[PDB]
Design a protein around this ligand. Structure first.
Ligand code: GTP
Ligand code: GTP
Ligand code: K
Ligand code: MG
Lengths: 305, 393
């Protein structure tokens, strides 16, 4: 159903992207950048500007329109928090295969409703909200991550954070390994794509030979991921998975920046997440500075270098 | 965000949920007079702080227990005098407790039955979930641990809303008998509806009780409001003091800086929540004690840098500052210039370790270099960590 749309996560050179809230400050700024990176940003939408252009690209009144006219298969949203949920819903309505919602601040209840909608359809895959987006290095960048630090390669990266993901990407390029696909699923408690969604893609992607999973306190997506890897990444051909879980020193009961990073009612602590992943054979880098070197050693041990 | 118990109880009361009659007081005399006004058989006096466990907490005044029952208005006054102005420490506050400025004087009711009831956006099943147990008055975690069986849940379909059947079912599972089931179901429905109305991520009632007289009453409530919903919960967030906030944290917030104090001497500030957590973590892993978590957000302003610095050096406990920034949107140079500029304007007194990476990084490093300031620039995060720890040994 919805799990079917998991494939839409693997953006590539053929992905045609439209920016919702195109003429807004964020949409405009990141759109110029997507353009320069080489993303196939083919237009955007904003109500009332259909038939106009912005940054030399066509604008359409509705996502429906933009999609039909441009053949866009992906949409990105930078719209302010109060209006972001409706933007997601519009993309889901227009059946955009992939929607990336960067916007931080969407009320959790709005996301609970968007999730209700999302799970009862199989056309639209949502990445986000509150996330940096997704990037297939050298092929397609949708979001706000710095393109230059990414180098097409062999590591699939899925992470609940933004900048900590950048460290990991950087580390992997410094050890010369590169990334196959990087998906920031965001720091919100309710979102459109979880770790398992990405792991599934990574496990079956020939170009992904190793995986880095970056997590943090709050929720139990890390635990679910561990359960998933225990079942699906066992066997002679298992891919090495390396992880770092942030918040080992986080105090209980405090939102740690991200809306979803909180240890509440005794649940969501980092240690348990690390333990769970370890039992699933994931090599957990105790230091966030050593993800690149840990995964490199794993490739090395398996003579995959 | 959490509001004080008296604020949460009024919201519930305003929304048809049954609570105990009460008045709020900020002085011992006012508590004494409120107790007389209640004209009740028995009065419950409760220190008002956000942390739970008040019932077993201790005050810096020597008083034990943050929740007391007494039949005498004068005792209410005497107890209150040992509360207002003092610090209440509980298993959920730090040892130096929290200052109590207000107390609730409510009408105590006899409790015939105590059950646990909560409504939360459950991260395990992407929707509101009714969580309940006939074993109330205790920590839900313990019941979960000891008797997972006594825990009941009803997943609610956000679009449909709570169904009569779910409410009735939960009412039965909580142990309310026939004549009261309906009353309990109704309250559960009103609680669910209130939960939604106010953008709560959690409404927890423990005990969700029964009195000998046949009244279904929410004796204690904790409501966690979704901070992301402030724009549409103006009136609710206006009630938030920020008074229990460690001062440093409130100053920081003013400048879109998310600070979380920890117990340590190595301060740090990073852009991005995961990185910020990872930064406190790596300090700890290298034998240091991070003084705080601080996320700058995504749009670093030399202002922020400056305030971040002003605020952290404000704290005497801080013996060193680790700055870990990974530049992208805002290139590292603008950042280095902010670092240097603040260094000059504040005359930093503790050692500073800076680790920048990302966009226009080289230039930024030249900035730090050409600045002539005693700023240790680290090779990477690990290095930044060992060096910052080295600084306070
Ligand atoms: N009979 C009676 N007991 C009450 C009433 N209100 C509170 N109590 C009791 O006062 C004692 C301490 O209060 P609790 O609410 O359990 O304390 P707590 O769990 O630490 O409170 P939080 O700080 O909200 O977590 C318990 O034995 C309660 O049952 C009331 O109206 N009547
Ligand atoms: N952490 C802590 N709790 C205390 C202390 N003194 C009392 N309490 C708790 O505060 C609550 C009220 O204390 P008291 O008025 O002494 O009542 P009590 O029923 O005699 O409590 P106990 O001392 O446990 O037998 C109870 O839940 C006590 O366990 C103390 O020094 N430290
Ligand atoms: K209680
Ligand atoms: Mg005692």
């Amino acid at each position: 159903s919805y799990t079917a749309s998991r494939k839409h996560l693997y953006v590539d050179k053929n992905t045609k992207v439209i920016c919702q809230g195109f003429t807004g400050k964020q949409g405009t700024f990141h759109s110029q950048q997507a353009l320069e990176y080489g993303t196939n940003l083919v237009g955007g939408t904003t109500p009332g500007k259909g038939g106009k252009t912005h940054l030399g690209l066509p604008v359409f009144n509705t996502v429906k329109e933009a999609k039909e006219q441009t053949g866009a298969t992906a949409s990105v949203i930078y719209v302010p928090p109060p209006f972001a949920a409706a933007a997601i819903n519009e993309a889901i309505d227009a059946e955009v295969p992939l929607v990336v919602c960067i916007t931080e601040g969407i009320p959790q209840q709005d996301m609970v409703r968007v999730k209700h909608r999302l799970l009862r359809q199989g056309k639209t895959r949502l990445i986000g909200p509150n996330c940096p987006g997704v990037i297939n290095p050298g092929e397609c960048k949708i979001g706000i991550m710095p393109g230059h630090i990414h180098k097409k390669g062999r590591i699939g990266i899925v992470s609940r954070s933004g900048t900590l993901t950048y460290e990991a990407v950087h580390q992997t390029t410094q050890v010369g390994l590169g990334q196959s696909l990087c998906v920031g699923i965001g720091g919100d408690p309710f979102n459109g794509t979880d770790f398992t969604d990405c792991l599934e893609i990574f496990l079956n992607d020939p170009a992904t030979e190793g995986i880095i999973l970056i997590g943090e306190i709050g929720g139990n997506a890390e635990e679910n991921a561990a359960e998933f890897l225990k079942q699906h990444n066992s066997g002679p051909k298992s891919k090495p998975v390396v992880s770092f879980i942030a918040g080992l020193t986080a105090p209980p009961g405090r939102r740690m920046g991200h809306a979803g990073a909180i240890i509440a009612g005794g649940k969501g602590g980092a240690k348990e997440k690390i333990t769970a992943l370890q039992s699933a054979g994931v090599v957990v880098s105790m230091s966030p500075a050593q993800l690149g070197t840990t995964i490199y050693k794993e490739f090395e041990k398996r003579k995959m270098l | 965000m959490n509001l004080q118990e008296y604020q949460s109880k009024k919201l519930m009361s305003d929304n048809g949920v049954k609570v105990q009659r009460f008045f709020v007081a900020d002085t011992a005399n006012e508590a004494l007079e409120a107790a007389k006004r209640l004209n009740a058989k028995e009065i419950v006096l409760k220190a008002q702080i956000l942390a739970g466990g008040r019932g077993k907490g201790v005050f810096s005044s020597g008083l034990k227990g943050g929740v007391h029952l007494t039949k005498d208005p004068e005792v209410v006054g005497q107890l209150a005098k040992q509360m207002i102005g003092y610090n209440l420490a509980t298993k959920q506050t730090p040892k130096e407790g929290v200052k109590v400025n207000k107390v609730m004087v409510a009408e105590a009711l006899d409790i015939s039955r105590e059950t646990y009831l909560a409504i939360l956006m459950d991260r395990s099943c992407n929707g509101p979930v009714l969580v309940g147990s006939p074993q109330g008055g205790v920590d839900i975690e313990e019941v979960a641990a000891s008797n997972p069986e006594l825990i009941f849940k009803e997943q609610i379909d956000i679009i449909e809303g709570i169904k009569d059947s779910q409410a009735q079912r939960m009412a039965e599972n909580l142990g309310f008998l026939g004549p009261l089931q309906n009353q309990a179901a109704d309250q559960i429905k009103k609680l669910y509806n209130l939960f939604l109305k106010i953008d709560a991520t959690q409404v927890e009632v423990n005990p969700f009780g029964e009195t000998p007289e046949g009244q279904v009453v929410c004796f204690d409530a904790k409501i966690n409001f979704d901070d992301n919903a402030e724009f549409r919960q103006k009136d609710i967030f206006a009630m938030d003091d920020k008074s229990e906030n460690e001062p440093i944290e409130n100053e920081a917030a003013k400048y879109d800086l998310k600070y979380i104090g920890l117990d340590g001497n190595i301060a740090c500030f990073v852009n991005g929540a995961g990185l910020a957590m990872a930064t406190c973590d790596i300090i700890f892993l290298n034998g240091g004690k991070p003084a705080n978590f601080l996320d700058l957000g995504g749009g670093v302003k030399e202002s922020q840098v400056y305030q971040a610095f002003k605020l952290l050096t404000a704290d005497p406990k801080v013996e060193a500052i680790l700055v870990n920034i990974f530049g992208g949107i805002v290139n590292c140079a603008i950042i280095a210039n902010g670092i240097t500029k603040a260094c000059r304007e504040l005359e930093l007194k503790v050692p500073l370790v800076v680790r920048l990476e990302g966009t226009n990084v080289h230039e930024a490093q030249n900035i730090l270099t050409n600045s002539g300031l005693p700023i240790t620039s680290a090779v990477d995060l690990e290095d930044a960590a060992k060096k910052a720890v080295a600084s306070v040994t």
